[PDB]
Swiss-Prot record, chains A, B:
Changing D186A: Loss of transposase activity. This is Transposase for transposon Tn5. Binds 2 magnesium ions per subunit. It comes from Escherichia coli. One of its GO terms (molecular function) is metal ion binding. PANTHER family: TRANSPOSASE, TRANSPOSASE TN5 DIMERISATION DOMAIN-CONTAINING PROTEIN. It comes from the Bacteria. Keywords: DNA recombination, DNA-binding, Endonuclease, Hydrolase, Magnesium, Metal-binding, Nuclease, Plasmid, Transposable element, Transposition.
Amino acid sequence: TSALHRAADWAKSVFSSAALGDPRRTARLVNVAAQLAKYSGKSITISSEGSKAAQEGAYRFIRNPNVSAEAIRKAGAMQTVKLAQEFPELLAIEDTTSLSYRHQVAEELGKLGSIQDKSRGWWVHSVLLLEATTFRTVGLLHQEWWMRPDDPADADEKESGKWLAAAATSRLRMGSMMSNVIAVCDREADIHAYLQDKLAHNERFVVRSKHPRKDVESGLYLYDHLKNQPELGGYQISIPQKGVVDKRGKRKNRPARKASLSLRSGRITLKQGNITLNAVLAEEINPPKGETPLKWLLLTSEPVESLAQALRVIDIYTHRWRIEEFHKAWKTGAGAERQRMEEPDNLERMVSILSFVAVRLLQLRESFTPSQSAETVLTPDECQLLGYLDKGKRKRKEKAGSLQWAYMAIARLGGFMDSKRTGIASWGALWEGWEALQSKLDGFLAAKDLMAQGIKIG
Amino acid sequence: TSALHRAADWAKSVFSSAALGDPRRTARLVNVAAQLAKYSGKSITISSEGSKAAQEGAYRFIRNPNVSAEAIRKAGAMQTVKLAQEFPELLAIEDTTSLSYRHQVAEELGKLGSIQDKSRGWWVHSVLLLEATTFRTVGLLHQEWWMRPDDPADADEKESGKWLAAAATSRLRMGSMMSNVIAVCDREADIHAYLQDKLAHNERFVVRSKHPRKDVESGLYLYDHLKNQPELGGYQISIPQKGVVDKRGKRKNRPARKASLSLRSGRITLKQGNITLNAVLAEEINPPKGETPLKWLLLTSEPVESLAQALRVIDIYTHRWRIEEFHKAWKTGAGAERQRMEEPDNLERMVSILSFVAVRLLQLRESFTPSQSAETVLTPDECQLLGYLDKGKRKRKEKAGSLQWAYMAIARLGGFMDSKRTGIASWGALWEGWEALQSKLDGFLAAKDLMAQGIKIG
DNA sequence: GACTTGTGTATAAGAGTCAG
DNA sequence: CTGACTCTTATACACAAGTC
DNA sequence: GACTTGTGTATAAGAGTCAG
DNA sequence: CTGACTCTTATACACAAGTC
């Protein structure tokens, strides 16, 4: 938030809490995180700016047997917890991804596909906290890493307990801030035991419905009972073009279209556990000749009885993609799967660090997104150089010297050409832009310095 | 050479000759090559520096049906031919690589593996010219692109004729400069018809021996006849550590070692075609308990009768890897296989351009490699900024302000940490460094400009 | 000349990718 | 998932700059 | 204290990758 | 191919800064 742009400051805030059992490890962590963040996406070596000291330090740290990766992730998360004190409502977006490897260490790791696959590694189940008003990323609350065994009957616990394990960690970490938190999960979380545990702790959630369950008071499947309700009202959406590549490698187009949805809600009770909760059902009115009609059924602790309360629910769900965006920031962006440590713990400690770097990529774009001047975000020196680099390229929409102009200017330095006329640049473009602006800033300052000590330039 | 660092200048020299049948196409080619070179490795869009004009231009050019990719490659090659006038002896390193794709266009392309593979594309057979004294890259003389058919009996010509086809093109292109040229090829070129054609044109070559052929005057296999000769003398080599990954995915180490070789030569005559030529044989004296003894048998037009003449031959061959280095510069570096044009000709015209970009990556490092001052290569402004950026990092080996220091300084800006204490940075590190130095130079100049118009910085 | 192609602008959307 | 994007191929105009 | 771990330097080499 | 590299994991010293 306040400590973001300056990588060293950022790393102190995230990591100085870490109980690694020696302040030298925590300071080292801080330094390491700092160089990696300044060089998001690149090798440790490249992050060391030619310092043999820092290179050696970084590598010694991530193979350090007194350094607990669990503790690294926990220390970051407590920072999230500290940050989250700022907000009256939060979303806790929850999902699993895989971290996949094929080098020699992969065989010491866990199953991701078939027993024979060379690609092995970890499953990580993550909780990403956003603030609920403007949806900005607060950070990681929780990650469970595990190695799936080759033999399913060697599992200590069933993988589906990951949703409850996460709840247990969030509540513990958030403490009394938990009633502030709304857990968002997809169909994998449509587990009776999971809904039950939330309600029992009086915790808050929006989980999408997969299994047809019956409502006690009507004796009907949730869907049939919800279709009985009066039309709470409607909403139309725009579905954006994209290409599509199926599981067998087959490519098709998905042309943009506009769909319109009828919304309904109701209070519902489930046979199992005699647990009561609410549910919203959005369904498409008159879909075109040959397309899957849209259909969302959402299970929620949240109020649903007014049209607006129900839209709050839909839109809380519409932000679920954000956890995938983190996964992409972790992998493609920060380089989790590009690492090549030769031992599991080494690979873990590194990739642990990289998860908070990932979050910061997200937050960097978010730091520029939202009315007034560029000076609120950039330094005076940053502000002038950007103005020079951008000369001519500024569009008429953009108020001169505004934070909106600063967003675009950086995006353009990152390569952004708005190919879909949406105005929105990827976090990847913003990062390249920021990094470019920062790199050109070295030269700018170097001239300033020399010019300040009375030396002629060129 | 002279026109290299400045991308626009470089592109004019390489491409202003192009007969595309409209000077507008040639100028467009020049512009396109220029932006791509300035942004080696990145997308067309990113290369357009926010110019909608240049983006649209670039894309219109590479889907232009009046633009012949053949002609693009030819125009570059004639520049090579023009450059090569400078040199009294050249190496023409010759080999094939594949350009491989899996997007929708791939199925309109040719076979690279089995009939069923999704990975399809072209085979390209290339001739890379170096000068023979200090081995610097002069450029591409020739490329043959073709699509291997699914059915081997649908081939217009056998693929092994590629060595002769290349000879035919080089001689035509080099004209009377051909007697300056020494063709270097590996075992695939150990074809009787190919040796014969060289000798008949009185062209010059070093080709490694695969098939046991017999010498007429002795009646012995080349190898047995060469082992009869007196020990012309010896030479020892250092073999550098590397990892090894076999075809089935199996990983092993190859530890560094020192090998010593005994050298022999002789004049030889082959039964077929009663063609006479020379041959050198290098073979390892007493290899360690369990390792493949080294063994090179080279067929050559070149003189071989003195120890030194024979070493000239070995070392001419020892530079064969350079064609692989080009292939890597073309693919990984310039991004040939990262392109995603949706039509073969579009994909070809683009990748054609990218092959000369590749060559320039090689030449950029080479432009810094070899006694005196940095000022011989960099501009005064470039020279100062680099000196600032490098403050503290300079080693004692490095004479202050020398071209040797400039090499290291750039390498360090590119991430180079000399992990194998060899002093040699990859072309990839030099490029990142150069690009970084260039990027920081924008800021430096921007401060200069503003400082020159009397505006306060920061 | 008679007719054809490239540029710079502006509008639109198909194809591809990651991760799923 | 109603993902979110960038890469790539289009199309129209007026008008400039080509071939023939 | 008695004993154990991190830093900055310097030396070395195994493991991995591309393209083959 | 005797490829050429970068990434990663080592090891010793003296000495500083930790745990117990």
